[PDB]
Amino acid sequence: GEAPNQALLRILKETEFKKIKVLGSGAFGTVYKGLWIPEGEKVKIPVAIKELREATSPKANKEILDEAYVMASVDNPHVCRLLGICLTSTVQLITQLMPFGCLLDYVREHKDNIGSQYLLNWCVQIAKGMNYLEDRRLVHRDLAARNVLVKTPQHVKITDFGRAKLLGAEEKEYHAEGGKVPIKWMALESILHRIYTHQSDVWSYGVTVWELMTFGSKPYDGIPASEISSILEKGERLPQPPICTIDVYMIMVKCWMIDADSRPKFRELIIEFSKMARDPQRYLVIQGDERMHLPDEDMDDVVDADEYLI
Amino acid sequence: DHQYYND
């Protein structure tokens, strides 16, 4: 019962964007901060440009293109869109520049100046992003603070669609094949049976919120991933973070229930966190909260990709 | 220090 996917995949010429600086590098390739300048449009768009190494396997290219396929098909304010791809000797993926980086890194770097209003807003925005993916019948399969990016301190987006799977309109579970997997973010059913669902994404949401609430701590730190599934069967979960009222923590705990259907729906998580976003000091207890404030390069013609629509 | 493990 699926509608046709009429998303446009935009093919970019290399002459249309200029790389400025190197954000990061890898065997896979190097990511560049740059500007995209669409031909004859008098606009400059801050972008991140992923250029793969020429030493790339056809298995590797195949995987990245499926990621682009997913990224091109999504249109939501809390999900990263693929602007386009460039088919050069080495393939280049173009996405919206997220200047403040990884949300995991941001909370670690700024743990001193982050108040309860920001934390709850982020939980709301991530829930919306996931709720949207759920609407598109998508299962992310890798939700975690490392895969949320910061456009600005006030705006965050879900990213890393490498493990994402579309669900047949009929089907409710995706059954995986063996791979390297983010054990400590995974629903039990995923770990035991390689079963994934929107509810298994809810589990990971739960862990992702805990990362934020503990300003970037490592879940189940010092305990081997090989022992995680038994601990979960024993009924142990991550501990209540110091700043958390029982209200918030109760919500995380619900995400980690063994019966996936007993976990909350993303639309419910939206509701409950935004209720708390209204009176943040009531729900997160942070020292000197009411005092904290959170916020490089021809910027005349510069436009954010969020305002560049086609 | 690896998030992803085989299994």
DSSP state string for A98-111 = -TT-BHHHHHHHTG
d(CA A23, CA A50): 10
Residue range(s) defining the domain that contains residue A201 = 98-301
Nearby residues of A178 by Cβ (< 8 Å), 6 or more positions away = A194, B6, B7
Residues written for chain A: 310
Residues A28 and A157 grouped into a single domain: no
Q: Can you give the CATH number for the domain in which A188 is found?
A: 1.10.510.10
Number of Cβ atoms within 10 Å of the Cβ of A19: 16
Looking at residue A37, the DSSP 8-state letter turns out to be -
**Hey, are the CB atoms on A183 and B4 less than 8 Å from each other?**
yes
The kind and range of the H/E element at A210 are helix A198-213
According to the annotation, is A73 in a ligand binding site?
A: no
Q: Which of 1-7 (B) contact A at CB < 8 A?
A: 3-7
Residue A69 contacts by C-beta under 8 Å, 6 or more apart in sequence?
A: A9
A248, A235 in Cβ contact below 8 A?
Answer: no
Task: Determine the Cα angle at A91 with ends A89 and A95, to 5°.
Answer: 145
- Say whether B6 and A180 touch across the interface (CB within 8 A): yes
Contact status, residue A94 vs residue A85, Cβ threshold 8 Å = yes
**Exposure of A169 by Cβ count < 10 A (0-12 exposed, 13-18 middle, 19+ buried)?**
exposed
Contact A225 B5 (CB under 8 A): yes
If 0-12 CB within 10 Å is exposed, 13-18 middle and 19+ buried, where does residue A200 land? buried
Does residue A68 lie within any of the structural domains? yes
Domain end call among A97, A132, A147? A97
DSSP A47-95: EEEEEEPSS--HHHHHHHHHHHHHHHH---TTBPPEEEEEESSSEEEEE
Q: What DSSP character marks residue A162? A: T
> Within 13 Å, how many C-alpha atoms sit on residue A67's CB side?
21
Query: Taking the alpha carbons of A27, A224, A263, A241 in that order, is the dihedral positive or negative?
Result: negative
Residues A85, A9 contacting (CB under 8 angstroms): yes
Q: Is A160 annotated among the ligand-binding residues?
A: yes
Same domain, A112 and A189: yes
Do the beta carbons of residue A95 and residue A46 sit within 8 Å? Answer: no
Place of tokens 């094949």: A177
Q: How many CB atoms lie within 10 A of CB A2?
A: 10
User: Which SS3 state, helix, strand or coil, does residue A310 take?
Assistant: coil
Query: Are the CB atoms for A127 and A269 separated by under 8 Å?
Result: yes
Contact of A254 with A242, CB cutoff 8 Å: no
- A238: annotated binding-site residue? no
Count of the separate structural domains present in chain A: 2
**Is A259 tagged catalytic?**
no
Whether residue A115 is found in the same domain as residue A64: no
